[PDB]
Design a protein around this nucleic acid. Structure first.
Lengths: 48, 104, 48
RNA sequence: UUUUUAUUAAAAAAUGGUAUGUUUUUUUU
């Protein structure tokens, strides 16, 4: 950009792209489920 | 929920879903020769029209020769004698087909 | 549900056999099977 | 004919278990 509007400190997720993308391979079941649940919450937020 | 496999939602059942692959699925001449004779007579007719074209060329040569003689339009070389030599060729090809039938 | 993505509730539970008939439309009798129609197709081209 | 991937949950109050109701004034003439 080089120009912006100074969002609030809590309006910066910093790891959203980690679960918006695909899950890395060879992960335990709980990590995969965590990725899926966070993606579900984001999708539900975006839908409404 | 995926390729027709699974339940709509895990809620309401004692399970968590989690479908798995089966891992044990077993994935396994011509009879009426009159056609050829008709084709032969038809190619004979094509040769007949070819020789009529040749006769027309000969008629053009005759017209040029007559024009040269006059110097010293378009005319026809033979109006009907070509039909007699045509009948001679008919006799010739009938002899050919007789010889071919005898050979077979 | 794409196997990497979220799972929700049906949002449409009206699929009971109230018609009680197969409509002689989707029957195997008059259908050419070449490749199975995966859900990726149903998500890529939802209207077809 | 070669390969797969899919993982619900989950704790607190009242019902529910030492009911409850009572209980001390400064003037007569």
């Amino acid at each position: 950009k080089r120009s912006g509007a100074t969002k609030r400190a809590q309006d910066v997720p910093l790891i959203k792209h980690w679960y918006l993308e695909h899950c890395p391979p060879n992960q335990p079941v709980k990590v995969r489920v965590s990725y899926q649940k966070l993606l579900k919450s984001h999708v539900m937020n975006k839908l409404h | 929920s995926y390729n027709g496999i699974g339940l709509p939602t895990p809620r309401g059942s004692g399970t968590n879903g989690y479908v798995m692959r089966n891992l044990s699925h077993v994935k396994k001449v011509q009879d009426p020769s009159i056609s050829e004779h008709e084709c032969r007579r038809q190619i004979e007719s094509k040769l007949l029209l070819y020789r009529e074209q040749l006769l027309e060329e000969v008629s053009s040569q005759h017209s040029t020769d007559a024009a040269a003689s006059d110097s010293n339009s378009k005319t026809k070389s033979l109006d009907e004698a070509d039909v007699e030599i045509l009948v001679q060729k008919y006799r010739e090809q009938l002899l050919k087909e007789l010889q071919l039938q005898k050979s077979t | 549900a794409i196997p990497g993505g979220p799972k929700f509730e049906p949002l449409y539970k009206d699929e009971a056999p109230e018609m009680e008939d197969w409509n002689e439309f989707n029957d195997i009798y008059k259908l050419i099977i070449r490749h199975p129609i995966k859900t990726e197709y149903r998500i890529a081209f939802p209207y077809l």
